[PDB]
Each structure stands twice: as structure tokens, then as C-alpha cells.
Amino acid sequence: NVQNMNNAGDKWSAFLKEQSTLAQMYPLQEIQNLTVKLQLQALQQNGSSVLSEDKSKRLNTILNTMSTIYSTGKVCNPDNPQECLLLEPGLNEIMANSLDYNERLWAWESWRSEVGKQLRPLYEEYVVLKNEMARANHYEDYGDYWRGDYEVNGVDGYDYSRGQLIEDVEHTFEEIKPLYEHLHAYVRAKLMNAYPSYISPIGCLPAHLLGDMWGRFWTNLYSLTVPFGQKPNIDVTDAMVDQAWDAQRIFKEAEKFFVSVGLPNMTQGFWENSMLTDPGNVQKAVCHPTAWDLGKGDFRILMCTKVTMDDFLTAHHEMGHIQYDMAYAAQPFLLRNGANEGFHEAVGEIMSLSAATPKHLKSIGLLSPDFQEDNETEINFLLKQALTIVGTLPFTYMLEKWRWMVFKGEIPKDQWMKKWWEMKREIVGVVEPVPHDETYCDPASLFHVSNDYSFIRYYTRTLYQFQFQEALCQAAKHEGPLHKCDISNSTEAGQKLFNMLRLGKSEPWTLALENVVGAKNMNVRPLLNYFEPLFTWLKDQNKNSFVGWSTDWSPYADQSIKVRISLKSALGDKAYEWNDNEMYLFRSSVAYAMRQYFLKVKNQMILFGEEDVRVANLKPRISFNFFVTAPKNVSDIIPRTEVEKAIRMSRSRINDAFRLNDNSLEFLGIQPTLGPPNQP
Amino acid sequence: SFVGWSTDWSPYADQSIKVRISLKSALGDKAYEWNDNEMYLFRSSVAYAMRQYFLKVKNQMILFGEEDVRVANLKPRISFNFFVTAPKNVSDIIPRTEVEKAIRMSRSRINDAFRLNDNSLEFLGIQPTLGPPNQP
Amino acid sequence: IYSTGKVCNPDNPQECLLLEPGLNEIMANSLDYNERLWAWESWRSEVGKQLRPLYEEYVVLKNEMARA
Ligand SMILES: *[C@@H]1O[C@H](CO)[C@@H](O[C@@H]2O[C@H](CO)[C@@H](O)[C@H](O)[C@H]2NC(C)=O)[C@H](O)[C@H]1NC(C)=O
Ligand SMILES: *[C@@H]1O[C@H](CO)[C@@H](O[C@@H]2O[C@H](CO)[C@@H](O)[C@H](O)[C@H]2NC(C)=O)[C@H](O)[C@H]1NC(C)=O
Ligand SMILES: *[C@@H]1O[C@H](CO)[C@@H](O[C@@H]2O[C@H](CO)[C@@H](O)[C@H](O)[C@H]2NC(C)=O)[C@H](O)[C@H]1NC(C)=O
Ligand SMILES: *[C@@H]1O[C@H](CO)[C@@H](O[C@@H]2O[C@H](CO)[C@@H](O)[C@H](O)[C@H]2NC(C)=O)[C@H](O)[C@H]1NC(C)=O
Ligand SMILES: *[C@@H]1O[C@H](CO)[C@@H](O[C@@H]2O[C@H](CO)[C@@H](O)[C@H](O)[C@H]2NC(C)=O)[C@H](O)[C@H]1NC(C)=O
Ligand SMILES: *[C@@H]1O[C@H](CO)[C@@H](O[C@@H]2O[C@H](CO)[C@@H](O)[C@H](O)[C@H]2NC(C)=O)[C@H](O)[C@H]1NC(C)=O
Ligand SMILES: *[C@@H]1O[C@H](CO)[C@@H](O)[C@H](O)[C@H]1NC(C)=O
Ligand SMILES: [Zn+2]
């Protein structure tokens, strides 16, 4: 079957480049109808193939090499080199379940460093080749090529520029920063009880204590940050196995939700062709929830559903992709997508929000008609939402802002990892535990960076999701808070939803938003109205706390020693210049001095290397900080009092290696002491 | 043919350089003792000198380490042979003529790290050359 | 350690060869000087180091059992 789909897959791809090279026979500005212009521009798009034919095969070699490094990485446990852990099984489980500080610090660092280095040279060669392909298609860089999805040209008042997306993201983000600061302060106060003597009460959060490998979602911090742990968060999984609900009941109650709002039934080919469970055969078949739109009005759902409220909800999510697909099936073929890249997931998740409410669960038969929702359980529910929704918004905004500045050249390649960690402390409020120089590439250790994907679609989908939900609940005549809303039994709300679903790509997306919301731009005020019961409760829990963070604190910067070097004072017109070969000799001289101290004082032999001296904050005056680490235990920092005694023992030897004289090589905090004079 | 073998030949011992160190001649009653921490500092000073030669002459950046300097035949008089290898290619030995040019470029820096004076740190086969005198 | 040793090819760290399949085939079939020199050294060094401390502790305990 794989050979059955590779030849049938290439007949589709070879056919499309043949019609693409036929499309440049027609000019594009001699067209008047907006629909036939939109189909022509989506087919005329050259994309690749604008490069030289030896540069085009170099780019595909880089994209295949970066993709197989990410999926085949082995991490070695420094106590047993015969057991290598590989990213998805084993390294993702440590970052999501462990409470050991030293084991989370190990998994972060190792993985990072290794994959980092590899993806470095490759990613560097990837930026040059992608900017050449974008400038041959008349964009300024590859970041402007990614923002071409949101572009709208000449439809009388609904236009949108590719540079206008940058201001609308930064204008909407500075209204989330009051809400994110109070969530950052509450999580920091709860993490100090889980990790004492590791977290500052006025500083950033360490990057390896956030719940996963990159801090993208904070959703694994719920067991440490739960407001009222003596109240069970509502879970209807036992009431499903007490009424003998089969595999088919979960979709038939899902189809009754959509026919309740005024949307069509399933297509009745949906029930035979689909595969709602893994089969009765032990059948090798990728088990991953998804919605297929094969064509010719044939819609199938592929998932392996278990009787759980989790897959009761993603059944409502995956059916939402189908009802979006069944609506625009009357457009031409090249306009059968969502209106932008963000609308398709956003319509799927407002079906899941409306089905997870306890108002909907007690009317669908799954909750005791004598159930009492208290105000303590609504805080437990809203905080679990904010760890996934609000916690991912400064991560998404910071990452696309870094990638946009790399493509246009505002960040040169000698400052990639310098500007990356300055933007973590300032925007996200997250500090690294170990300093990282320009041999690492920490963005490329994420999936979407090393596999060539755009990331701004996760920011805009979060904002469209609550704009849709607030506009539908005013049509369904809701009375309470926004997070209690349900659009069942309405017809007027579904008519408000169906007027957008059938457009496809035939209209500009700004014209699609006014059919539901009533505005021409994305707005953050419906997102904040969802979380005002949490924002009121959060401001009362932070009366004795400090809201905000300092970008100066680090988890290593209290065992560091500052070094200051004055070369032109000692030698003057005859002094060498301080390149990074002199930094290599300095790190070997400190590692030599630590070896001599532990042998002659502590009677131990420890093999310190130059890779165990970690240098941060290199300035032009020639100043940096350093701290010393045990040879393969990255979590073991030698204390500052033992490094001062080691440097005092061998200060005369370090001075002679650089021709300095204790006034041109200063260790700040260590002073020369002895020397009584006399002789007469 | 020749029947039998010699126990003196080695496949690396024609790109090796012999080093001789006379500690008690340079300092005398006040000289440190040569443990294996001093051999670690010597292997880092040679790796530093190979880094500076390839950057300023060959315009390349190569990350030589102390594990790329291979020391053999350590004696009590303080003498050994060493040869330099490319950073992870164990089969690539840097030639003897390129290591002599790298040591000549940074001999004054290696001497200062050990307080020796070109008669107490001898690289056998490399000689000091310059120094014309005058002033009147 | 002897039965589960991985050797990494310095041009692709994502492919580790383990003694009986792959490292014994290089030493028995190759005519490349630089590839035989790599397989010898690598394997040697790694397993070498490990078996060192262990083998050192093994001599002391086996001499105690023999002298009793
Ligand atoms: C060009 O634009 C016109 C309107 O601007 C489209 O005309 C409509 O076409 C459909 C079927 O093709 C008719 O049912 C409508 O009644 C037409 N509208 C009007 C106002 O006459 C036309 O379809 C566009 N061209 C293409 C190829 O789609
Ligand atoms: C697709 O690539 C072609 C080049 O192969 C681009 O085209 C040319 O258009 C100019 C006019 O601007 C002509 O003078 C050239 O003759 C065309 N190419 C040649 C030499 O055949 C074209 O602009 C690209 N299309 C897109 C999507 O921008
Ligand atoms: C849930 O509602 C109850 C009922 O109002 C709240 O209890 C009140 O809390 C305030 C502030 O601490 C007190 O001044 C009142 O006297 C309490 N009412 C009673 C009847 O004792 C409770 O604080 C609410 N919980 C949350 C999380 O909002
Ligand atoms: C929302 O829709 C459901 C589904 O039709 C309605 O549920 C019915 O409720 C009545 C009385 O409450 C029962 O006698 C029926 O058996 C229910 N039908 C099903 C299929 O379970 C519900 O009443 C509707 N809500 C409103 C306010 O009309
Ligand atoms: C690496 O160093 C850390 C200390 O920084 C070690 O953690 C200690 O582990 C022991 C037992 O495992 C505990 O009794 C100590 O309380 C731990 N120290 C701290 C500060 O938490 C860790 O064991 C070291 N790892 C290795 C492999 O030696
Ligand atoms: C390691 O160094 C050796 C040389 O000592 C390299 O072998 C050369 O390989 C090229 C092509 O592979 C041949 O043209 C040369 O004739 C080889 N040299 C010798 C002396 O045989 C080897 O390629 C290097 N390995 C790496 C990974 O760089
Ligand atoms: C959808 O199907 C049900 C039975 O499966 C049927 O009763 C209902 O009328 C259908 N909806 C419409 C709009 O016909
Ligand atoms: Zn989805």
C-alpha cells in the first residue's frame, strides 16, 4: 500500500506542475472578476523551482536531514551509556511527569545541546536558500512569504497588508499582558512550594520546570497549581460505562448536537466508509484522530475512539471539521479551504467548548439532575483552561517575532542565541538554567522550526475562537458568563455560523469575519471576557505577591565570578588581541587550577575540562562571568567559596600564561593579601 | 626478505616531535613537580597553538582539543613524543612540518605558561633562530 | 557492556554499530585503511574505559577467593 500511494501521489504532483506552467500564459492584471482572479493566483504560484536546479536539491537535502535528526535523537544517561532515550518515548515523559529538579535539568540540557549543535549549521544554510526563493517570487524575505496568507488585495474596504499583520499582533498582545502577568505570578508562588531553594520570588521562571520540553503549554502544571484540590474537576467517564454506550453513541449524540443548531445530517456514506475504532483485526493502521475530505462529496472520519469524555469531546471537534467541509463544497476546487489558515481549527474548537459545559451534559443525559455547580469548581475549570490558552500566547508571539527578524536580517548570525534568550526574559518571563553561546540552536529543537512550518496560525486561532463564541452566544440569548454558554436548540446562531462556513476562500477573510462577529479585524476583548472570573480571583491571590519579573536574576548567577581583563594597561602597544582562542586557553587554565586544588587539598582526582567552565556575558572591555561544574553532572555546581580557594592557589600560574600582573587580571571578590616588607 | 621484526618502529613515529623538559635547571630549588595535571596543561597549550596557526595562516577555524594531542613514551627525565590529530578523524595526522610552524609561532606563549626559557623546554628538531644585536 | 556497545560514525551520530552485526563485518571484509583504523580505535577506547574500573575491582575479589 505504500508503493500504491507513492505512485498515485506523484501523479497528482506531476499533474499540478504541468498546469502551473500553463497558467503563466495568462496575465494576471488583465482580469476583472475577483473569483477567477483568486483561482489564478493560487495556481500561478511558483514557490520553489525559481532556484537553480543544484540549489533546489541542496534545499531538499537539508530539509530531510533536519527532519531525521529530530526524529532519531538518542540521549545518554551519564551513569549508564548503554541506554539511550529518544525524544517522544522517554524524554517527553520525564519533562511531563518528574518532580526531580536534577533530572528535569538533565533532560533539558542534554537534548538541547546535541540536537542544537546539529540543527545549527543546517538551519544556517536553510535561511540563505529560503530567502533566495522568496526574493525570486518578489517578496523581501521568507517571513514576508509566510504572511502572504493574510493578504487581501482590492475588494473595496476589506484590504489587508502583509506588514499590517505585524502591528495587529503586537497591538493585541499588550492587552493580554495584564492577564498573563497575574497568571505568571500565581504559578511562580505555587512553584516555590514544589521546588524550594530554586526559584526567586521576584524573578523569571526557570526554563526546565514548565511541564514540557519547551514551555509551549503549561498544562502539566495543574497538579501543582490547582486552586481547590479537595473538589473533583467534573469527569463523566464512569457515567458512560454505566449506560453501555458503544462506539456509535458518541457520534450519534454528536450528530444530534449539530442538527440541534440547524446544520445538516451526516451524509449516510459517513457511516459505512468511516473507521470509528481500530478494527477487530489486529490491524496496523495509524491511530490518529483526523477528518478526511477525499472529494466528490465523500467525507470520512478516521479515529480509534475509546469510551471516555476525552474522545467524547474530540468527536465534537472532528465532526466540526466535517461540517465546515460539507458547507463550502459548492465552490470551485481551488477555493475549498478555510478563509485563512487559522479558521479551520477555530471552528472545530467552539464545538468542543459548547459540549464540555455542565449545562449541556445534564441535558444530554450524563449528569445527576440534582447536580450543584459551585463557584469553587468554576475556578478549577477556568485555571485549567488558562494554562493551555493563555500560557501559550507569549510563547507563540515570541517565536514568530524571532523568526521574522532572522529572515529580514535584523539579527545577524553572531547574535541568534543572544537575542533569543533576551526575548525569553522580557516577553515570556523565562530564564535559562545554563548559559548558551552561538554553538547552540535552541529554536531548531522544536518540531515546527526544524520541519519548516509556520507558527503564527496558533496565535490567530486562539483569538478567532473566542470571537466566534461570543458572537454566537449573543444570538442564542445567553444571560450568564461566557464560559457557561451552549448553542444547543438554537437556529438563529447556526444561521449566523452557516453564513461564514459556505464561503471557503471565495471572499476575503476580513469579509468573512463581519458575517459572524461584525468587525473586520481580530480582537482580543472577547478572549478577556472569557477569563474575567479568573482575573478577578487572581488579583485577590496576588495581594502580598510581586506582579512582574526581573530580567537580571539567573539560577546560576550567585556562584559566578566576574573577571576583568585590562590588556592595554599591562602591555600597551604590543598586546595581543582577545579572540576566542584566548577564551579557550582561559577555560583550560581554570580547569587546571581546579584539578590541582582537589588533588592537593581534598586528595581526590577529578577530570575537569574546558567544557566544565561556563562563560556568560562577554563584553568588549573584556569581562565575563564563569562558574565551574562537575565533569558530566550538569546539575552539580562547585560552590563559589571552593573556586576562590582554587584560584588563590594557582593565581601566579594563570597570570604567567597571559602575561598579566594581578592588576590586569582581576577576579572580583578575590584580593591579593600577603607580602610583608623588610630586610635591614 | 628480512625474517624477524623490530620493536622500535611505529606507524605514528615519523610525525612525532620529542620534547625535553629540564625543570631543575630553570628554577632549581623552587621548581614544581611534574604530575599529570601538568601534562593536561601541556596538551591544552599545544592545542591552543594549533588553533592560532590555522586561523592566522590558513584562514580556517578548527577546534583542536587536548584529546587530539597523543603523548607516548613518558620518561622520568621528563621526555615524551607527541603528534597532533584532526579533531574527530583519528586517521588524519597533521604533518610534522605544519606542527613545527605552529610551535614556532607560539613558542613564547608556551614558555610563559611553564616558566621555561627555550633551553629548559626543547622541541628536538626546532631551533631558535633570530636576534641580531646592536644599538651603537 | 560487551554485548550492548554502540559505536558512532563521526559523520552521522544517528547510526550506532554494535560489535557482532556491523563492527565484526568491517574488520573481516574491508580493505580501507582509514575505516579499519576507525573501527579498531573507537570500539577499543569506549569498551576499554568501561571495563577498566570494573576489571580492576575484579582482580582483587578473585584473588581473595583463590587465597581462601
Ligand atoms: C464572474 O462574476 C459574476 C458576478 O460578479 C458571476 O456571476 C454569477 O454566476 C452564477 C453562476 O455562474 C449565477 O448563478 C449568478 O446569477 C451570477 N451573478 C450575477 C450577478 O449575474 C460569475 O460566476 C463569475 N465568474 C465565474 C467564472 O465564477
Ligand atoms: C515564475 O517564474 C518565471 C520565470 O521562469 C517568472 O517569469 C518571467 O516573467 C518575466 C516578466 O516579468 C518574463 O520576462 C520572463 O520571460 C518570465 N520567465 C521566463 C524567462 O520564462 C514568473 O514571474 C514567475 N511567476 C510567479 C509566480 O511570480
Ligand atoms: C463562593 O461564594 C461564597 C458565597 O458568597 C463566598 O464566600 C464568601 O466569601 C467572602 C470573602 O471571603 C466573605 O466575605 C463572605 O462572608 C463569604 N460568604 C459566606 C456566606 O460565608 C466564596 O468566597 C466564593 N468563593 C470563590 C472562590 O469565589
Ligand atoms: C434541547 O434539545 C433537547 C433534545 O431535543 C431537548 O430534550 C428533550 O427534553 C424533553 C423535556 O425536557 C424530553 O421529554 C425529551 O425526551 C428530550 N429529548 C431528547 C431527544 O432527549 C430539550 O428540551 C431542549 N431544550 C429546550 C429548552 O427546549
Ligand atoms: C549530580 O549532582 C546533584 C547535586 O547537585 C546530586 O543530587 C544529590 O543526590 C543525592 C542522592 O542522589 C541526594 O542525597 C542529594 O540531596 C542531591 N543533591 C541535591 C542538591 O539535590 C546528583 O546525585 C548528582 N548526580 C550524579 C550522577 O552524581
Ligand atoms: C580522515 O582523514 C583521511 C586522511 O587521513 C581521509 O581520507 C581521504 O579521503 C579522501 C576521500 O574520502 C581521499 O581522496 C584521500 O585519498 C584520503 N586520504 C588518504 C590519506 O587516504 C578521510 O576522508 C577523513 N575522514 C573524514 C570523515 O574527514
Ligand atoms: C436527520 O436524520 C434523522 C434520522 O437519522 C431524521 O429524523 C432527520 O429528519 C434528519 N434531518 C433532516 C433535516 O432531515
Ligand atoms: Zn483538528
Bound chemical compounds: a molecule of 2 linked components (NAG-NAG), 2-acetamido-2-deoxy-beta-D-glucopyranose, zinc ion
Percent of residues in helices of chain A comes to 40-55%
Global Rg of chain A: 30 Å
Strand order of the largest sheet of chain A: 8-9-7-10
User: What composes the largest sheet of chain A?
Assistant: 4 strands, antiparallel
Number of beta strands of chain A = 10
Secondary-structure content class of chain A? alpha+beta
Give the N-terminus to C-terminus distance of chain A in angstroms: 100 Å
> How many helices of chain A in DSSP terms?
28
* Greatest interface by residues involved: A-B, 17 and 17 residues
Question: How much strand content do the residues of chain A show?
Answer: 5-15%
Shape by Cα distribution of chain A: globular
Oligomer: part of a larger assembly
Subcellular location (chain B): Cell membrane; Cytoplasm; Cell projection, Cilium; Apical cell membrane
Glycosylation sites (chain B): 89
Organism (chain B): Homo sapiens (Human)
Protein name (chain B): Angiotensin-converting enzyme 2
